[PDB]
């Protein structure tokens, strides 16, 4: 329940033509969190008083 696992931004690749590296600054981009939205995770933390 909630965001017990520490946040770590997933790395990736894209182009802009130059090839670039990326870091995804969203917790739900992590494998452990991909099945939930930010709001669902937040409500879980609120219910568990992990604010």
């Amino acid at each position: 329940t909630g965001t017990t696992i520490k946040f770590n931004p997933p790395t990736g690749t894209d182009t802009m033509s130059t090839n670039i590296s990326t870091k995804h600054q969203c917790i739900t981009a992590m494998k452990e969190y991909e099945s939930k939205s930010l709001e669902e995770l937040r409500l879980e933390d609120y219910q568990a008083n992990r604010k």
């Binding site: 909630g2 965001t3 520490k6 946040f7 931004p9 790395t11 990736g12 894209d14 670039i20 590296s21 990326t22 870091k23 995804h24 600054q25 969203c26 917790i27 739900t28 981009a29 991909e34 099945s35 939205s37 930010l38 709001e39 669902e40 995770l41 937040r42 409500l43 933390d45 609120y46 992990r50 604010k51």
Partner: protein
């Protein structure tokens, strides 16, 4: 009667903090916890009234004056965080949707609120539908249902099953669009009675976050923009002459040798006159876009926290955006002592393509 644009400009002394780098108007007496949703009154109400729901379970109303002065008017309470709010078309009612699994109808003149909807999980979206033959409230929930309510009986007038948890929705009669978990994307038609119209393979490869319907030259709903957690927005027409070229995506809400930081798109709204659009992001910036010319009109300076929500007033002379933590990095980056803000900007000409 009154100014089109009247906030003027803040000055710094002729002779220090990053909370408001645009120096936009600050709404007085802002909510005490993160702001989830914003909604301005319909054109049927004289003047401009703003509603905000927050993670402190409250819904608040302010009068917004042409000068930028804001007067708190009224407030109501849910027993859980408020996820979405909207108005009835006559401006008499505000509808509110909560993590407490219910939605309320709030009559502003009498300042009374009653429950009008019940779900088996948090209510994520709420919209008012005014059709020629019926009027109802539409609620979307993490219980994977879409329900429709007459505001008088506690039995829903219809229940539609969703493929997954409701994440966002928009309604411009006769169109509704809903995005769900696992990248579900469904368009509904609303003539006679709501029914599913098309299930769409998502133009985006990442978790869906926000959606807004846009209109064609004849003022009829014709497409929608859809934002994901991956700093990307899709423009998607319902029936274009050349889908492979007319439907497209663009990158936004990114920062930047070093890796480029990708942030979530938290909100999307179309300017009601110009048909241009604003996006707000977890990067703490707003951007203004022209989806026809395929251009960026403006990006803001970066705020010291995410922008969680945005909206326009009925004629688009005021753009409102909320500076609030969005949980994009989980509980560890929540600072319960950092202040929340709603900012207002006269952005109409910034949203008018030259």
């Amino acid at each position: 009667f009154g100014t089109t644009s009247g906030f003027g400009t803040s000055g710094t002394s002729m002779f220090t903090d990053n909370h408001n780098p645009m120096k936009d108007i600050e709404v007085t007496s802002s909510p005490d916890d993160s702001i989830g949703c914003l909604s301005f009154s319909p054109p049927t109400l004289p003047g401009n009234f703003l509603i905000a729901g927050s993670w402190a379970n409250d819904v608040r109303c302010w009068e917004v004056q042409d000068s930028g002065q804001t007067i708190p008017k009224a407030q109501q309470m849910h027993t859980g965080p408020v996820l979405d709010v909207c108005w009835s078309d006559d401006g008499s009612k505000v509808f509110t949707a909560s993590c407490d699994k219910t939605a309320k109808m709030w009559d502003l003149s009498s300042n009374q609120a009653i429950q009008i909807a019940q779900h088996d999980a948090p209510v994520k979206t709420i919209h008012w539908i005014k059709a020629p033959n019926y009027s109802c409230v539409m609620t979307g929930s993490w219980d994977k249902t879409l329900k429709f309510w007459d505001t008088r009986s506690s039995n829903p007038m219809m229940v539609l099953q969703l493929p997954e948890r409701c994440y966002c929705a928009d309604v411009i009669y006769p169109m509704a669009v809903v995005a769900t978990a696992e990248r579900g994307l469904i368009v509904y038609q609303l003539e006679n009675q709501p029914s599913e119209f098309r299930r769409i393979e998502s133009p985006l490869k990442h978790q869906h976050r926000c959606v807004a319907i846009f209109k064609d030259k004849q003022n009829k709903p014709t497409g929608f923009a859809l934002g994901s957690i991956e700093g990307r927005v899709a423009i998607h027409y319902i029936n274009p002459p050349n889908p492979a070229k007319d439907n497209f995506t663009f990158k936004c809400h990114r920062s930047n040798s070093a890796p480029q930081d990708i942030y979530a798109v938290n909100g999307i709204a179309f300017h009601p006159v110009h048909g241009t659009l604003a996006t707000v992001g977890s990067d703490g910036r707003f951007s203004f876009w022209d989806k026809d010319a395929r251009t960026k009109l403006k990006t803001s300076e970066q705020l010291d926290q995410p922008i969680s929500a945005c909206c326009f007033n009925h004629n688009g002379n005021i753009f409102a955006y909320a500076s609030s933590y969005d949980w994009s990095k989980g509980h560890e980056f929540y600072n319960p002592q950092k202040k929340n803000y709603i900012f207002l900007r006269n952005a109409a000409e910034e949203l008018k393509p030259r």
